Amino acid sequence: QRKMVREFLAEFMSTYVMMVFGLGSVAHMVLNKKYGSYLGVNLGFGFGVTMGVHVAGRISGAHMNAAVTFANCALGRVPWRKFPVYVLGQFLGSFLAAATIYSLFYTAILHFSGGQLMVTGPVATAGIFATYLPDHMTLWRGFLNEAWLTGMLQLCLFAITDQENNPALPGTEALVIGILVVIIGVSLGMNTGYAINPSRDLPPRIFTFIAGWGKQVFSNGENWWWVPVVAPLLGAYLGGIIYLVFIGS
Amino acid sequence: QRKMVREFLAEFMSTYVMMVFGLGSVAHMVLNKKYGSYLGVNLGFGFGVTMGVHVAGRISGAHMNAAVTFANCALGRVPWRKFPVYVLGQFLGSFLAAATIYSLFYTAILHFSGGQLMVTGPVATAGIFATYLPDHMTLWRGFLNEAWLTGMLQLCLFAITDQENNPALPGTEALVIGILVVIIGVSLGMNTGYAINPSRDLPPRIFTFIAGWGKQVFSNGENWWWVPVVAPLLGAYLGGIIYLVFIGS
Amino acid sequence: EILQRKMVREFLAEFMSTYVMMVFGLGSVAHMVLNKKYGSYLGVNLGFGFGVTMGVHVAGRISGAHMNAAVTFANCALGRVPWRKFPVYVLGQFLGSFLAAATIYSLFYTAILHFSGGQLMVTGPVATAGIFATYLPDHMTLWRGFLNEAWLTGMLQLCLFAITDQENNPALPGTEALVIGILVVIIGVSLGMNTGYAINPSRDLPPRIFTFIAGWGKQVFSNGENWWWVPVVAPLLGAYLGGIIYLVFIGS
Amino acid sequence: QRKMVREFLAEFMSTYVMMVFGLGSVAHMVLNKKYGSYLGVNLGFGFGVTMGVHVAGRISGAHMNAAVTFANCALGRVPWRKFPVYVLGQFLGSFLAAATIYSLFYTAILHFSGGQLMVTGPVATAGIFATYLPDHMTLWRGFLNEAWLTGMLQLCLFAITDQENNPALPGTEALVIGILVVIIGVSLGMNTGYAINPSRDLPPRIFTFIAGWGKQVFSNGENWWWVPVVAPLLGAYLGGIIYLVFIGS
Structure with a gap:
């Protein structure tokens, strides 16, 4: 054994249940669209x-990301090297979860996706795990659409916890934290997905690149795999700072 | 009227009042599709x-069916001689709540079907009450989808009820568990619906068979009246051991 | 130059507790059966x-917040309240909802007229009246029109009493409210299809008496061979039947 | 940097978070309609x-919607000289909010606008920043309606922040105050597009008239910009008092 691995069971049984709802429900829309909704x-x-x-142990490991994994080193909260263990350790909850929703849905796309795992197009099923920015954007703007989609994932997250500026109640912190996330998929989710953490962009994208969809998950759009893995990083520490501008300093 | 009948009558109404909020829920979602949506x-x-x-003995037996009452008799809880009394007491209701979602939709299908209580095609009033698998799938994996739909609500039913690992609050349960069954249906409802408990599947399929439709309500997945009665009991053991091998042992 | 403390300071706060319900609920029925694009079921x-x-959040949190001329008749025969001061909960916030209808109407004076010609249409594909009161969409006679409103009433209380029986796992002292309309939220995805949910004799005698006054005519009280008396006598014999199905489970 | 002036930051943010969840959420039903909704x-x-x-000075420095601030000022729950501060510093939480949701969607807009800014017609844009009255609207309703939209905002606000008469718990505020305005949303925006607080109109309107839309943003409604700057001020002065009679007192 213990002393850092009772938690990596929670970090995993937290991210292995995030991507089942957050990233494993988009096949509920992009496969029937009258059984499932955007x-x-x-x-x-x-x-x-x-x-x-509800799982991760109340402050002692609940990140599920690498955007907020990274940031919670900006300040002396959780010093730097508790962090790299959670990045790779909590890709698994998104990779071998990305299967626990890919393997249970074969019969569904095999009558919707023909017999061919096409990456892009009119029966494309490669969106379900990765992030692809449609016709009307660039990376002039797709970087600033994850370093601001995660910059306020931090301002809005430091204001639901710090027990100074009057946030949630004891157990009434999950409902609001999820309600925090409803209203970004429905506000700025019309843009570079809302792959807002470097653990929905890559970890099920290296799960698509493995099952047989092709190299079009690493290249469709000049080179994408990187910005939802590099923007949340110097987006997170830059968003909770501009927050922490008003109370600290 | 004693101690242990004040245990069905308590678990009888949460298998007659969840079901009337879930049966007409479909008998309105798809029975009209305009007043009743996706x-x-x-x-x-x-x-x-x-x-x-909020309608059971506070947190000391509030299961609502014959499916989670079984994980909590082998994984140590509620000795087995209190398992089937609750199951049936519950089950004993699932029929008593459909047979009254009938007289509530009496002339809501006779102006829809004709006078024949059809189950497939242009007139579709037996995919509402029970479930019935779709045309894209066999039982090869609609069982694996029902030992995973009834084998992963236990990681949530533990993170919200168990109090050591930081949960919702005492009023805060129904709204973080009823807000699960919506979050369960926003991903994994595009497979078998979700027929996650055998107290929701059999007594309303025993009703579609006694209302006048006949034995075809069973002969639908060519045999589906046990796949969500043996996959759901075999997810509650397979999951309840995932959180307790995760934390415990 | 006189006293105004009494229960008339319940009356007054049943008034809003109703009036503020309606301008939210009634205000929304317009918002689908009048725009369908900016509005939905x-x-x-x-x-x-x-x-x-x-x-x-407008009435005493449990003592003063019925806002429903019927829950005021359910908690009288069981006994949680005396009788002789049942009027001034109906005749308060039911002429508290009548006068919320004329405040959703004259709030929509333009917004409707372009939707229904220049006609105060009760029945058709230009129907309006359904904003204020309810009508049975021909799916039924009264045989099911009284049996969807005294079971829809006795599916209400058993979900009311359970969140306010501070004995048997209700909400907090401060989350009663977030639930008890999210009772009504769900009433509209399981049961909201045939007669709607006109459970509320303050949403169905008061506003119907409004429309008939601003001119929808003597057709508001006929649609159903006469549909008015039902949700005014359908909830009272289904609240009394509604909350004794609970206290025959844990009471006496 | 620590006095009354560490409070524009409390409501720069608290207002900066009010626009950008919305102006981008109203530019999201309006720009795809299949990856979005009303x-x-x-x-x-x-x-x-x-x-x-959950961003501002706990309950008495967290308005953000400066027509409340007018009436929470004039009924005596604020020093009359600390009215302009909470506005203009939250009024800038609305400028530098539009400029910063016009940006995130810069690429998404011009693609379906070809290179030009239209206020009316079939390429309506600035309905998301400012507001404009429909086919079915005059300023008879143009004003009598924003006095009950800045009206009902109050009785339902005050009934929650005056902690005498059944309010929410001190974590339940923001869930059930935010859950108010979603109820003003699906009740009362199909007459005006509820501007309720002139915070939400005049600054991004002043933004969109600088943003090159030219003076049509002050035209439609013959002159529509003035009302949800004024009906709110002497429309929440009435949502306040009508409370303090029937409730309170």
Whole structure:
């Protein structure tokens, strides 16, 4: 054994239940669209990220990300090298979860996706795990659409915890934290997905690149895999700072 | 009227009042589709779970069916001689709540079907009450989808009820568990619906068979009246051991 | 130059606790059966539920917040309240909802007229009246029209009493409200299809008496061979039947 | 940097979080309609209060919607000389909010606008920043309606923040105050697009008239910009008092 691995069971049974609701509900929309809604996803992710703090041990490991894994080193909260263990350790909850929703849904896309795992197009099923920015954007703006989609994932997250500026109640912190996430999938989720953490961009993207979809998950758009893995990083520490501007300093 | 009948009558009404918030939920989602929409039953049976959760002996037996009452008899809880009394007491209701979602939709299908109580095609009134698998799938994996739909609500039913590992609060349960059944239906409802408990599946499939439709309500998945009666009991043991091998042993 | 403390300071706060429910609920029915693009069915499923959770933060949190001329008749025969001061909960916040209808109407004076010609249409594909009162969408006679409103009433209380029986796992002292309209939210995804949920004799005698006054005519009280008396006698014999199915489980 | 002036920051943010959850959530039903929805406006708005709420000085420095601030001023629950501060410093939480949701969608807009800024017609844009009255609207309703939209905002606000008469618990505020405005959303925006607090109109309107839309943003409604700057001020002065008679006192 213990002393850092009772927690990596929670860090995993938290991210292995995030991507089942947040990233495993988009196949509820992009496969029937009259059984599933673009709401079923943006609402899936938040009110499923409730189960994801109901588990992780109250402050001692609940991140599920590498955008907020990284940031919680800006200041002396959780010094630097508790962090790299959670990045790779909590890709697994998103990789071998990305299967625990890929393997249970074969019969569904095999009558929707023909017999061919096409990456892009009119029966494309490669969106379900990765993040692809549609016709009307660039990376001039796709960097600033994850370093601001995660910059306020921090301002809005430091204001639901710090027991100084009057946040949530004791157990009434998951409902709001998931409700925090409903209203970004439904506000700025019309843009570079809302792959807002470097653990929905890559960890199920290196799960798509493995099952047989092709190299079009690492290249569709000049080179994408990197910005939802590099923008949340110097987006998070830059968003909770501009927050911490007003109370600290 | 003694101690242990004040245990069905308590678990009888949460298998007659979750079900009337979940059966008409579909018998309204798809029976009309204009007044009744695509969530329809995500938040109908979902939050119709919240109701019930506030209607049982506080947190000392509030299971609502014959499916989670079985994980909590082998994993140490509620000795087995208190397992089937609750199951049936519950089950004893699932029939008593459909047979009254009939007279509530009496002339809501006779102006819809004709006078024949059809189950498939242009007239579709037996996919509401029970479930019935779709045309894209066999039982090869609609069982694996029902020992995973009834084998992963236990990681949430533990992170919210168990009090050591930081949960929702005493009023805060129904709304973080009924808000699960909506978050369960926003991902994994596109497979078998969710027929997650054998107290929701059999007594309303025993009703579609006694109302006048006949034995075809069973002969639907060519045999589906045990796949969500043996996959759901075999997820509650397979999951309840995931959180307790995660934390415990 | 006189006293105004009494129960008339319940009356007054049943007034809003109703009035604020309606301008939320009624206000939303317009918002689908008048725009259909900026509005939906679901909007009333929950905009009526959280119209009632803002009814609650307007009346004593449990003692004064019925806002429903019937829950005021259910908690009288069981006994949680005396009788002779049952009027001034109906005749308060039921002429508290009548006068919320004329405040959703003259709030929509333009917004409707372009939707229904220049006609005060009761029945058709230009129907309006359904904003204020309810009508049975021809799916039924009264045989099911009284049996969807005294079981829809006795599916209410058993979910009311359970969150306010501070004995048997209710909400907190401060989350009663978020639930009890999210009762009404769900009433509109399981049961909200045939007669709607006109459970509330303050949403169905008061507003119907409004429309008939601003000119919808003597057709508001006929649609159903006469549909008015039902949700005014359908809830009272289904609240009394509604909350004795609970106290025959834990009471006496 | 630590006095009354560490409070524009409390409501720069609390207002900066009010626009950008909305202006981007109203530019989200309006720009794809298949990866978005209207509810997204009213609950991406209401729960974007929620986050507005948990940002500012606990309950008496967290308004953000400066027509409240007018009436929470004039009824004596604020020093009359600390009115302009909470506005203009939250009024800038609305400028530098529009400029910063016009940006995130810069690439998404011009693609379906070809290179030009239209205020009316079939390429309506600035309906998301400012507001404009429909086919079915005059200024008869143009004003009598924003006195009950800045009206009902109050009785339902005050009934929650005056902790005499059944309010929410001190964590339940922002969930059930944000959950208000989602109820004003699906009740009362199909007459005006509820501007309720002139915070929400005049600054991004002043933004969109600088943003090159030219003077049509002050035209439609013959002159529509003035009302949700004025009906709110002497429309929440009435949502206040009508409370303090019937309730309170």
